[PDB]
């Protein structure tokens, strides 16, 4: 059942094509895009999920945007192509937030395409291709590998995202927010996307120090890398007498970790297989808010800690769904036009953010990391009661 491609394991470097890079995007442009590239004059959102661009030539292009799960079967891709073959001359694109975009020539075609895409359903009732993600609404959630593929997660990406987008679904295909809300997710603090810079961010968090596999550590780890992996100097080299699984007694090179000095970042485990830390009841979620990358009005912002722990509750994470909705609702009701969540929080003051969003505040929100922590505290009598 093994079928060779032409590759020859005994002559591995023969007919090896390499260093050819990606394809050039012009291989794939719709004709209207190829023709008008660089000559775009202005745009408009015709209605949720439908954009129009006017070119200098007078040409128009209509883009219809729909949601995507990011994680996706070939059968799903093949169905995206079928759609594009029927309506869009075989062209399509994906966005930087992993929505899907189909381009057509007139408003009438775009409206028909939206109505078609909105009709498509998976078994179980979920929309295959829900239309929206434009203007001042809530768009797709940028997210990571979680338990589908990564070994350092503290939570699941695809699950938490499915949960939050169900919860907020009605806001995807509408434009009622003070500004578009970017929600992101990362399953550990490596943050493999946008958590550190989103309006609301969901972050997989550990609350327990590594469990040390002493018998294997020196065999599987470069000990000095594990020591250097620690942002807080909690790890140090040492020798130790142990009894192996076989019941033999020997002394190994290993590490010692001062538990009171560890803050569960997981970085020593990235460097060293013998320092795993994942734990069912310890692991959960941190929520952050107020970050952004645009330079519009205000300068890019980091997102800040606003919830210290929500437990993991697979498969439906209700407390998560509840907390996000609660933040989004307070923001949508109070913030001024064009304000991002962070603009809002900073203007009213974080003391008012916590009260409007009905969030608890603790020890955990107060920066204590090196000399910059100092700056985050309040060096003024300008506060609200």
């Amino acid at each position: 059942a093994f079928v060779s491609s032409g590759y020859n394991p005994e002559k591995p470097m023969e007919n090896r094509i390499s260093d050819i890079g990606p394809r050039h995007a012009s291989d794939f442009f719709p004709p209207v895009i190829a023709k008008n590239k660089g000559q775009w004059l202005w745009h408009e959102i015709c209605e949720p999920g439908i954009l129009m661009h006017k070119a200098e030539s007078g040409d128009e292009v209509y883009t219809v945007r729909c949601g995507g799960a990011r994680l996706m079967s070939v059968g799903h891709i093949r169905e995206i192509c079928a759609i594009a073959d029927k309506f869009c001359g075989g062209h399509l694109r994906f966005t930087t937030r992993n929505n899907i975009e189909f381009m057509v020539t007139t408003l009438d075609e775009a409206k028909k395409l939206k109505e078609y895409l909105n009709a498509q359903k998976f078994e179980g009732g979920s929309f295959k291709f829900p239309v929206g993600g434009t203007g001042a609404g809530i768009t797709n959630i940028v997210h990571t590998q979680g338990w589908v593929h990564c070994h350092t997660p503290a939570t699941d990406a695809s699950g938490t995202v499915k949960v939050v987008l169900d919860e907020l679904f009605e806001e995807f295909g509408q434009m009622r927010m003070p500004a578009q809300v970017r929600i992101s997710m990362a399953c550990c603090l490596n943050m493999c996307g946008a958590v550190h810079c989103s309006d609301i961010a969901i972050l997989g968090y550990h609350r327990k120090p590594p469990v040390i596999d002493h018998e294997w550590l020196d065999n599987l780890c470069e000990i000095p890398l594990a020591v250097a992996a620690c942002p807080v100097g909690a790890i140090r080299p040492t020798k130790k007498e142990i009894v192996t699984e076989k019941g033999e007694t020997k002394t190994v090179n290993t590490v010692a970790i001062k538990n009171e000095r560890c803050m569960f970042c997981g970085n020593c485990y990235t460097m060293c297989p013998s320092l795993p830390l994942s734990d069912q009841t310890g692991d959960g979620l941190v929520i952050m808010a107020g970050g952004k990358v645009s330079n519009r009005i205000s300068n890019p912002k980091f997102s800040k800690v606003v919830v210290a722990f929500i437990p993991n509750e697979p498969p439906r994470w209700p407390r998560l769904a509840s907390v996000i909705r609660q933040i989004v609702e307070a923001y949508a009701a109070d913030a001024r036009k064009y304000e991002r969540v962070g603009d809002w929080a900073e203007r009213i003051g974080w003391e008012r953010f916590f009260e409007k969003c009905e969030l608890d505040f603790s020890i955990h929100m107060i920066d204590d990391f090196r000399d910059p922590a100092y700056y985050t505290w309040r060096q003024t009598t300008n506060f609200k009661f």
């Binding site: 079928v3 060779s4 202005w42 209605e47 079967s73 930087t96 979920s126 990564c150 493999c192 890019p300």
Partner: protein
């Protein structure tokens, strides 16, 4: 259904496209196998993925073993190897490697190309993907070690496409869609992205650096690929001359004839557009005013934040004198803290073959490759050796634009050549004038 999935089953309902429904669909297609594909990895790969994932939902911890070192000959990265930690229970994901496939800039495709890729992955992998990886790659999720070279061979020979990057190398560069479909792109971002990817193929396929490095290319300050937060070298378009104003179009906004912000807020009642409240009063430098029904802008004082253009795309346009700024150091927290890009080059012209941009890139790399410690990002090296060192390395002199603010702590280093008399001082010379 090879495995009971009662937790995962709860994510089949609700309106948002269900990754569970989809993966279940794909497992059924492989089982039916109605196109007669000689599947190269276990047929029930998707079933076992659903099973192991269900186990994770049950016990709340990951079930992938640590790490994995796999790849194709000639390349030091491109594939993230992975092995499930319960291979007897889930033989179908015993090997479950991800292949990172280089994407076109702006992620435009034809169905021709995607169908080709699907046929390939159907046969030689799991038939599961991510579109797209956070860095921008086409992600093909799950295959076996023996199939890595076979897939690569077809990808290069039949498809003319390469792998993307992983490891301590130049990673896959991404751009916003640039001038393909946006009136604000200040340079051909997809082109510069492509051309930089091609120029440095060796640094991407063969890890040569102290750590990872990323490029991202935004056509204007809106930052639609988020380069300022997610690339070590971030390239962001601007212009340096005047905003172009169409006064008749201004008068049409004022008169209710065009919705502000291209209709972005049409789902809520925010009242009739008021240019004074929505534009003039929000401009961060207060550099705009209305005079006899005409908009005026003091462009010298404009920081090109984009606000007014975003509110009024039909009346305001970018300037004609265009280029980009280059910012360095962005990265996630580990080790020393999260960073966004710090301004390095305020303005540089963009012009094939982009020699001047290549000089910045290579000057930064030459510095960081010598001085960077193991697993030290550029941002961390900038903090270690200082912003002034970065400025020196690309052959610039410090300008006020290099800071948001001058320092306040007065712990200031001087070079000896700059201090009259230097540092070679004898205690006897001092004691001549000052009794013990």
């Amino acid at each position: 259904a090879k495995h009971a999935t009662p937790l995962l089953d709860q994510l089949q309902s609700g309106p948002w496209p269900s990754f569970v429904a989809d993966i279940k669909e794909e497992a059924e297609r492989r089982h039916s196998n109605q196109d007669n594909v000689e599947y190269q990895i276990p047929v029930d790969v998707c079933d076992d993925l659903l099973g192991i994932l269900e186990l994770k939902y049950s016990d709340g911890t990951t079930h992938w073993k640590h790490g994995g070192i796999v790849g194709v000959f000639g390349y030091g990265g491109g594939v993230i190897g992975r092995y499930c930690d319960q291979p007897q229970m889930f033989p179908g994901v015993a090997h479950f490697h991800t292949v990172r496939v280089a994407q076109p800039a702006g992620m435009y495709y034809t169905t021709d190309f995607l169908k080709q890729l699907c046929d390939l992955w159907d046969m030689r992998g799991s038939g599961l993907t991510n579109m797209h990886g956070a860095t921008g790659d086409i992600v093909l999720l799950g295959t076996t070690t023996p199939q890595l070279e076979e897939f690569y061979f077809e990808l290069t020979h039949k498809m003319n496409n390469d792998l993307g990057g992983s490891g301590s190398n130049l990673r896959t560069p991404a751009s916003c869609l640039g001038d393909s479909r946006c009136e604000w792109a200040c340079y051909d971002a997809q082109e510069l992205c492509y051309q930089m990817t091609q120029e440095y193929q060796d640094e991407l396929h063969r890890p040569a650096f102290p750590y990872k490095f990323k490029f991202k290319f935004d056509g204007c300050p809106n930052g639609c690929v988020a380069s300022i937060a997610r690339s070590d070298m971030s390239f962001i378009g601007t212009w340096r001359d005047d905003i172009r104003i169409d006064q008749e179009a201004v008068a049409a906004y004022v008169g209710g004839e065009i919705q502000p912000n291209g209709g972005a807020h049409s789902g809520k009642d925010w009242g009739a557009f008021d240019i004074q409240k929505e534009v003039i009063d929000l401009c961060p430098t207060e550099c705009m005013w209305m005079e006899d029904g005409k908009l005026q802008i003091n462009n010298r004082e404009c920081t090109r934040c984009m606000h007014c253009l975003n509110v009024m795309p039909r009346a305001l346009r970018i300037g004609n004198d265009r280029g980009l700024s280059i910012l360095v150091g962005a990265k996630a927290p580990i080790l020393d803290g999260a960073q966004m890009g710090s301004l390095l080059v305020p303005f540089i012209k963009v012009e094939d073959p982009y020699d001047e941009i290549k000089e910045i890139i290579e000057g930064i790399w030459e510095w960081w490759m010598e001085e960077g410690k193991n697993r030290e990002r550029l941002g961390e090296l900038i903090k270690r050796q200082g912003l002034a060192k970065a400025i020196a390395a690309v052959g610039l002199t410090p300008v006020p634009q290099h800071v948001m603010e001058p320092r306040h702590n007065p712990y200031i280093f001087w070079k000896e050549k700059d201090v009259e008399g230097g540092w070679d001082r004898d205690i006897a010379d001092y004691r001549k004038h000052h009794q013990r």
